[PDB]
Design a protein around this ligand. Structure first.
Ligand SMILES: [Cl-]
Ligand SMILES: [Cl-]
Ligand SMILES: [Cl-]
Length: 163
């Protein structure tokens, strides 16, 4: 475990993370995809061997000894708000199981279903709250990665409001 488990947020490419493992915002078919998924495919392409997994699940594949946790959030274009909310919560619970099983002291994680799977809606708070619900019982240092300047400020505020 980390000596004093924390949450932090950084605005940069998660392919440049300084953590012991990464969470990919994966598609169910293990395809290169776009956004975070394409950055992860360029950096860790070996981790896409048999990475296909259903919505609401996570599947870990090693790139060398570096673990890539492929977490499949729902595409809110296809799911109802109710069913999508359930699957987005479930993907983060499976990430927390994998992080615990791997015994890592730190993990880099993006906000699932906030980009091209958002169905055109701002889901920062919904996705971050499901991240906290799953990760709060883990003792890894969690570093959340984002690309937008306003999102960085809002994620940092949400972390600080609970400390
Ligand atoms: Cl960058
Ligand atoms: Cl997304
Ligand atoms: Cl972002």
């Amino acid at each position: 475990g980390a000596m004093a488990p924390s949450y932090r947020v950084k605005r940069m490419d998660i392919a440049k993370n300084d953590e012991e493992c990464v969470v990919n915002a994966a598609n169910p078919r293990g395809l290169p995809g776009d956004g975070v998924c394409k950055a992860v495919y360029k950096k860790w392409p070996e981790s896409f061997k048999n990475s296909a997994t259903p919505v609401g699940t996570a599947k870990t594949v090693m790139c060398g000894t570096y673990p890539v946790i492929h977490a499949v959030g729902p595409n809110f274009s296809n799911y109802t708000e109710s069913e999508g909310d359930r699957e987005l919560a479930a993907a983060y619970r499976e990430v927390a199981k994998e992080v615990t099983r791997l015994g890592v002291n730190s993990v880099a994680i993006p906000l699932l279903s906030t980009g091209v799977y958002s169905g055109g809606k701002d889901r920062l708070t919904q996705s971050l709250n499901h991240l906290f619900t799953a990760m709060d019982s883990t003792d890894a240092d969690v570093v959340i990665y984002c690309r937008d300047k306003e999102w960085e400020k809002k994620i940092s505020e949400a972390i600080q409001m609970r400390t």
